[PDB]
C-alpha cells in the first residue's frame, strides 16, 4: 500500500473528464459539465504490487493564486493531453510544461504525453510531429480513445512506472 498522486492537464474540450471516468467507472460520458473539478481514488494492481491512485481532474478557469500553487504542487506526475483533431490544443503543450516546472523547482519531473480522440478519421496532427516533440522533452507518447477504451489503462500505468524510476 503505497500511494500515488496523478494530475491530468490540457486545453478545454480535449477529453480530460472522459478519460478519468473511463478508468474509475468503466463507462463513457457523451458530455460533462466543463466547470466541475474533482478528485477520485481507486485500488489497482500494477506488476503485482497493489497500490492506491489519487487522480485530480482540472477545470474551472485560468487563475493564479498562492493556494492553487499548493494544490498543484502536491502532484507527483502529470499527463499532458491534446486532441488529434484540434491543432491549437497541440501548440498549448509548451505553456503547460513551463507552468509545471515553475511550481516544482526542478527540470526533471515525471510526465507522459497523451493524444486523445484517435477514433476520429479527420487527423490534423500527424503521428510523427507528436513523436518528435516527445523525444525533445524526453518522455513517452501514447495514443488513446475514450469512446472505445483503447489505451486508457496503458496511459495511466505508464505514468506510475515513471514515478518509480524517479525515486
Amino acid at each position, epitope marked *: 500500500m503505497t500511494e500515488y498522486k496523478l494530475v491530468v492537464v490540457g486545453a478545454c474540450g480535449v477529453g480530460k473528464s472522459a478519460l478519468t471516468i473511463q478508468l*474509475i467507472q468503466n463507462h463513457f460520458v457523451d458530455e460533462y459539465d466543463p466547470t*466541475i473539478e474533482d478528485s477520485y481514488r481507486k485500488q489497482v494492481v500494477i506488476d503485482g504490487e497493489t497500490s492506491l491512485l489519487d487522480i485530480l481532474d482540472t477545470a474551472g478557469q485560468e487563475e493564479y493564486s498562492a493556494m492553487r500553487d499548493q494544490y498543484m504542487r502536491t502532484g507527483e506526475g502529470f499527463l499532458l493531453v491534446f486532441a488529434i483533431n484540434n491543432t491549437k490544443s497541440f501548440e498549448d503543450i509548451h505553456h503547460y510544461r513551463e507552468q509545471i516546472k515553475r511550481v516544482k523547482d526542478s527540470e526533471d519531473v515525471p510526465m507522459v504525453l497523451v493524444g486523445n480522440k484517435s477514433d476520429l478519421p479527420s487527423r490534423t496532427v500527424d503521428t510523427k510531429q507528436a513523436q518528435d516533440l516527445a523525444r525533445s522533452y524526453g518522455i513517452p507518447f501514447i495514443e488513446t480513445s475514450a469512446k472505445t477504451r483503447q489505451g486508457v489503462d496503458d496511459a495511466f500505468y505508464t505514468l506510475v512506472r515513471e514515478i518509480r524510476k524517479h525515486k
Partner: antibody, heavy 122, light 110 residues
Framework: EVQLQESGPGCVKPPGTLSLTCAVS?????????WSWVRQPPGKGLEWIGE???????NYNPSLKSRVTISVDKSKNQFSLKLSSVTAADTAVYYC???????????????WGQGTCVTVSS | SVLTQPPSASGTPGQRVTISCSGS????????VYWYQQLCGTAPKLLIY???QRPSGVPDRFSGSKSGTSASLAISGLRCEDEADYYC???????????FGGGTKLTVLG
C-alpha cells in the same frame, strides 16, 4: 464549487421518525470525500451526528449510535438521514457538509449547506 | 461538549485578544486542531486548520497555536468585523468521532 441544499419536514410529532435529504450540485457524490450531518440546538454549541462514504462505510456518534441511519443514493446525487424515536430534545437546526479530502486535507467541514430547522412537539 | 472553552472574551479596538481550548490525551493530545468562525444567522466558516495555517481570504491578524493538550487562538488589530462565535474541533481516538468545544462569544468594547 459544490453546492449543498437540505430539505425536510419542519414539524414532527413524537414518537415518529425524522427524515431529511441533502441534494448535491456542482460535483459528484462519487468523489473521494466524506459527507456529514451536524446539528445545533437553539442557542447552544454544535454536535456531530455521523459520516458516510460513497461505498457504504459509516461512522456514528457513540451517544446516538442506536438511533441513527445514514444512506447514499448514487442515482440522484444525494444522501439522507433518519432518526427514530424522537423526543423534544431533538429540536435543532440541521446542516449537511463535505470534507476530509484525500487530495489536500483542510479538515472535516470544507463546505456547508444553509441549514434547516426541525421542531419536535405534541 | 468534550473540549473546554471559556464562555466569553472581550477587548477594545486595536488591542490583541486570546481564546483557549483544553482537552485530553485522546484528542487534542494526539491530533490536529481546527478552528471555525460563525456569524449569527449563517453557517460556520473555516478559519485555521492544522494548528496554524490560514485558508485563502483570512487576513494575517489570525494565528493559532498548540501546546500539549491545549490550543490557543490569537487576534490582533481587533475590529467590528470580528464579533462572532468561535469553536475548536478535533478527532477522538477513544470514541472514533469528532468533538467540539463549547463556543466563545467575542465582544468589542467602546
Amino acid at each position: 464549487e459544490v453546492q449543498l441544499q437540505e430539505s425536510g419536514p419542519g414539524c414532527v410529532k413524537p414518537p415518529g421518525t425524522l427524515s431529511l435529504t441533502c441534494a448535491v450540485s456542482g460535483g459528484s457524490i462519487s468523489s473521494s470525500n466524506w459527507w456529514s450531518w451536524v446539528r445545533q440546538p437553539p442557542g447552544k454549541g454544535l454536535e456531530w451526528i455521523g459520516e458516510i462514504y460513497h461505498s457504504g462505510s459509516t461512522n456514528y456518534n457513540p451517544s446516538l449510535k442506536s438511533r441513527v441511519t445514514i444512506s447514499v443514493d448514487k442515482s440522484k446525487n444525494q444522501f439522507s438521514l433518519k432518526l427514530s424515536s424522537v423526543t423534544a430534545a431533538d429540536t435543532a437546526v440541521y446542516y449537511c457538509a463535505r470534507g476530509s479530502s484525500s487530495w489536500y486535507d483542510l479538515g472535516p467541514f470544507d463546505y456547508w449547506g444553509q441549514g434547516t430547522c426541525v421542531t419536535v412537539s405534541s | 461538549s468534550v473540549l473546554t472553552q471559556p464562555p466569553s472574551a472581550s477587548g477594545t479596538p486595536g488591542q490583541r485578544v486570546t481564546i483557549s481550548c483544553s482537552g485530553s490525551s485522546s484528542n487534542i493530545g494526539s491530533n490536529y486542531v481546527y478552528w471555525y468562525q460563525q456569524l449569527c444567522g449563517t453557517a460556520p466558516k473555516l478559519l485555521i486548520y492544522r494548528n496554524n495555517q490560514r485558508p485563502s481570504g483570512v487576513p494575517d491578524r489570525f494565528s493559532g497555536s498548540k501546546s500539549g493538550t491545549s490550543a490557543s487562538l490569537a487576534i490582533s488589530g481587533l475590529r467590528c468585523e470580528d464579533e462572532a462565535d468561535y469553536y475548536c474541533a478535533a478527532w477522538d481516538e477513544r470514541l472514533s468521532g469528532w468533538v467540539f468545544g463549547g463556543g466563545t462569544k467575542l465582544t468589542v468594547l467602546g
